Amino acid sequence: GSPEFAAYKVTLVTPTGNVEFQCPDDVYILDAAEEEGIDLPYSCRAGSCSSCAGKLKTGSLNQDDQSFLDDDQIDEGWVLTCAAYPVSDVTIETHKEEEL
Ligand code: FES
């Protein structure tokens, strides 16, 4: 039932407004946002820090490539946007490092 290629609608709730774009299912959220000209926080780009943190509001992600968040944090909706792939349409609140 699965497509050979897919993308998903990403809605980012950023400090300067909501923005939306299609993200390939094999491109990380951060990278796809940047390709669309959206400036999001980051540092390591390796899944091992707090800089790119966001909160997942709607939908589902694959965060196998992240390491810094613990299992409880993942269960509570934390996202490292540099290391997350969408597996559905998603809504993510960005710029959330301060809440960790
Ligand atoms: S920029 Fe460090 S985990 Fe994403």
Numbering used by the authors: -4 to 95
The authors write:
The noncanonical amino acid, para‐cyanophenylalanine (CNF), when incorporated into metalloproteins, functions as an infrared spectroscopic probe for the redox state of iron‐sulfur clusters, offering a strategy for determining electron occupancy in the electron transport chains of complex metalloenzymes. In conclusion, we have incorporated the noncanonical amino acid, CNF, into two FeS proteins, and in each case observed a small, reproducible shift (<2 cm−1) in the nitrile stretching band of CNF following cluster reduction and re‐oxidation, which is consistent with an electric field effect from proximity to the cluster(s) in different redox states. We also obtained high‐resolution crystal structures of CNF‐labeled proteins in both the oxidized and reduced states, demonstrating that site‐specific placement of CNF caused minimal structural perturbation, and giving a precise location for the CNF side chain in each protein. In the multicenter hydrogenase, DdHydAB, the nitrile group of CNF is 12 and 13 Å from the [4Fe–4S] proximal cluster and the [4Fe–4S]H subcluster of the H‐cluster, respectively; the fact that spectroscopic changes are observed at this distance confirm that this functional group has long‐range sensitivity to redox changes. These investigations lay the foundation for employing site‐specifically incorporated CNF to probe the redox state of FeS cluster‐containing proteins by IR spectroscopy.
Spinach FdI was selected as the first model system because of its small size and the accessible redox change in its [2Fe‐2S] cluster. Recombinant FdI was purified by GST‐affinity chromatography followed by cleavage of the GST tag, and further enriched by anion‐exchange and size‐exclusion chromatography for crystallization. The reduction potential of wild‐type (WT)‐FdI determined by cyclic voltammetry, −0.40 V versus the standard hydrogen electrode (SHE) (all potentials are subsequently quoted vs SHE), and the UV–visible spectra for air‐oxidized and dithionite‐reduced FdI were consistent with previous reports.
